[model samples]
Structure formats: structure tokens, C-alpha cells
Target: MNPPPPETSNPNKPKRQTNQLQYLLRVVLKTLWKHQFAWPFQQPVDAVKLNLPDYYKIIKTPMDMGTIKKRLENNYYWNAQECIQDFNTMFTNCYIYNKPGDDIVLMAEALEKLFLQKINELPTE
Candidate 1:
């Protein structure tokens, strides 16, 4: 059966879920920041200097943990899934840009797996 569209269904329910999601999103970012593989993803890639001339074209929306932290800290993200997607975009770029078995690729796989393990704590819609 079809459920009512979220916005029209109830106002307070989504608002409460937002609050819980926000708290947990912060925790997830902090935990990821604490990881060793986090260093490669801490800041945006300097494509010109990094020696990957093709990087700019392949990754249109380059995401880094640092910028996402800014998004989280400023309360810029309206939804947790959007927040989660940014991390995936970040991880997938790593997944795509590197060799399949490369250290960074493997790192992104492990780290993203770990991320999902923790992100499951997000409140359900």
C-alpha cells in the first residue's frame, strides 16, 4: 500500500526524525575522521598537483570529509540520506579513480563498509 507523502502526512514526525538523524550524522563523521584511511579523504583532491590530469573530468562533484563536516556543522544538510549520499559520492570517486585492488580503493571499500556499519544507526524514515 502507498503511504502518504512525507511532508503532507505529518509535520512533527519528520522534524523529530531530523533531530535524531542530525545527532547521529555528527557522530558518524567524527568516527570517520578518527580513521587512518581518513587522511586521503580529509581535503579535496588537488588534481592539478596530484598528477591525475583526468581527475577533474571524471569526478564532477568532488567530495571530501572536511567539506562534508562543514555541511554537517552548519546544519546545511536537510536530510540524512542526502548526507549519506555525499559520503558515497566521495567513496565512489575513490572506488572509480583508483585501480580496483589499489590501497586507496581497498581503503575506501573498508572505510565505506565501516561507515555503513555505523550509519545504520540513522533514524528510519
Candidate 2:
């Protein structure tokens, strides 16, 4: 028979899970950075200067910047699902909603593809 699942409801459980989630989040952010994706709240000029490939046009708006930044800064305090939700929200607001040119659309698609691949590489409890 399969062993019982770990007690996720325990209030005093060690932070191993939390740390793992945070590490995963950091890895995602680092990959984005390496690809020159715009950070939340990044100034328009800075975003443009990133000169991302034609496909990944930088949205000049600072939409959802604060929320993303806060979540990333305190990632260790959030659960794995919450972290993933935050990333989805950022992508929706910054890329999907903005409706940039074809290049931008292609960029978002590429990023999502890479993000999913990296996420799948992370260890699960």
C-alpha cells in the first residue's frame, strides 16, 4: 500500500517545502531575466532598452508591478500554488491584456513554454 501523505495541515512543519517553492520561483525569475523579459514595474525606457527580440515586445505600462514585486520579494512566505498564481496573473496583465504586436505574442508564448518546462523540473513533495 502507498504510505500516507505528509501532514500538510501542520502549523509547525519545517520550512523545507516553503524553501523549495521559493527556490523554484527564483529560478523562474532568473530565467526570465536571462531572456531579457521585463520585470514588473520596470520603467518604460528600461523596458524598451531591454530591446527584447522583435517577438517579445515590452509592454511599457507598469501594470501589476507592485503585486508581482511584493510576491517575488516575499516568495518564501507564500505557498507553491500562490506563487504560481502570481506568475499567471503577471503574464495575463502584462502580456495577454496588453495585446501587443505579433512579436510580443510570440514572446509571451515562448516564455510560457520555457516557464512550464522549468516548473516541471522542480521537485514536488
Candidate 3:
């Protein structure tokens, strides 16, 4: 399907609503939770369930993976293993969905990249 329509500035939608990261976070969490795999075997079908009209108002698209990765890294700093554990849990629990011809290898690669990006954002000691 069409990667979501290019983001647009909606006058009816306000900046405060679009700027809130919480909605994106919720969408990410819910997506993983519904998918059920600690890691996805393939790109999911319609994984984004967040009320886009509301979430898009604040989330600058196209869903910046770097920013998302940073959030994951920040989580790691807060509790070390727990952070990673939760991150994995969130990912697996929410993203493990079944799909025909799903490519585990690709998904694994993507996960690695995603994790690395997040780790890159970590504060250096």
C-alpha cells in the first residue's frame, strides 16, 4: 500500500497536537504489542493504528527512525538491561505479527539498524 500520504500542515489540526511525541510512542507500543513478535519477520500490514489525524498533528513525518531510535537509547540509560529488555519486549510483543512471505533476515537487519541508531544517540561516558 501507499506509504502514508506525505505529511501536510493541517489548519484544522493544531501544532500542539502534532508536536506531542506521546501519541507516536503509543502507536509504536501498540503496534508491537499487536504484532506479537519480539522481532518482526516482515514489514507489518497496517501496523500504524494511532489516530493519525490527531497524532500527525504533532509528529513530524515520515516517521523519523533516528528520533525513534534515540528514544529507545534514552530508555537504555534509565535502567540499563531493563531498558533494553523493555525495548525488546516492546518491539517483540508489539511487532511479532504473521505475514505471508515474511523475510526474517530483512527484519533482523532492520532491527539491528534501528538498535544501532538508538545506541548511537547514547551519551558517551
Candidate 4:
């Protein structure tokens, strides 16, 4: 089925030209899927994998996970810097608490879970 139309234009305001570009990209992806010429690729070998952050490394260094949890729970800060700082703190805390032999791998798994959960939470629009 065809996708819904883009938002209406505003002559008095600046025109956003990229809507058509995005629509074209989406159409390409759908076409590839329909032809069975795309996907079933392992994430490690796919473009999606590149977008994943190395939370384990971030946690091991300046950032800690516990601080992140506290900040998120407390609503301490509303911006990206606060968000990153908190996440780093929380990750470090988790690493220290877990003391796992495969801490990096385990942390990466946890981050992947978080990534999937956040993606699920996003609004369709």
C-alpha cells in the first residue's frame, strides 16, 4: 500500500525540500524488501550496526551508568549533556557492581536492549 502524503506546504514559510528525498529512500527500502533483495543480514554486517554506540567503552571511562539511572529517575537535567553524563555514570556503576569477567560484552548486550526498548517507545509519526 502507498504511504500517507507529506505535510501541507506553507507559502509564507520556508519550504522543506527533503520530504521527497526521504520518501524516495523509504520507497527504495520497501521495494528492496518486496523483491526479497534486502534484509536477513546480521547486524554486525549491516548499516544498522554502525549506528550503535559503544556504551561499554563509554561506561568504562568518564561515563558511569549509576549516575545516569539516578539522573533519569530524578529528572535532574533535561538536555543531552546531562543525559550523556548520567548514562556514563550509571554504566560505570553497573560495571563496578556486576564485576563480570565478560563485562564489556555484557554491557554491550545491555546497551543493545536499551536501544531496542527506546526504539520501540518512539512515536510512529
Best by lDDT: 1
Angstrom error of the Cα, residue 46, model 2: value is 11
List TM-scores for all candidates, in order. 0.78, 0.53, 0.27, 0.28
Query: Tens-digit lDDT track for model 4 on 1-125?
Result: 12222122335534222332232223422332233212221111112344424423333333323333333333444333434443344345445534566645474445635533443332232
Q: Candidate 1, which ten residues in sequence have the lowest lDDT sum? A: 1-10
Model 1 residue pairs with clashes: none
lDDT of each: 0.72, 0.50, 0.38, 0.35
Q: What is the lDDT of residue 68 in candidate 1?
A: 77
Question: 62, model 2: CA deviation in Å?
Answer: 8.2
User: How much is 98 displaced in model 3, in angstroms?
Assistant: 2.4
Candidate 2 lDDT tens digits, 5-72:
21223355333346547655578656655665444323222333454443234332223334444445
Off by over 4 Å in 4: 1-61, 80-103, 123-125
TM-score of candidate 1 versus the correct structure, residues matched by position? 0.78
> Would you list the rank order by lDDT, best first?
1, 2, 3, 4
Winner by TM-score: 1
lDDT for predicted candidate 4 compared with the true structure: 0.35
What TM value does model 2 have?
Answer: 0.53
Candidate 1 local Cα displacement, residue 10, angstroms: 27
Instruction: Tell me how candidate 3 scores on lDDT.
Output: 0.38
> Cα RMSDs of all predictions?
9.6, 12.8, 12.8, 17.8
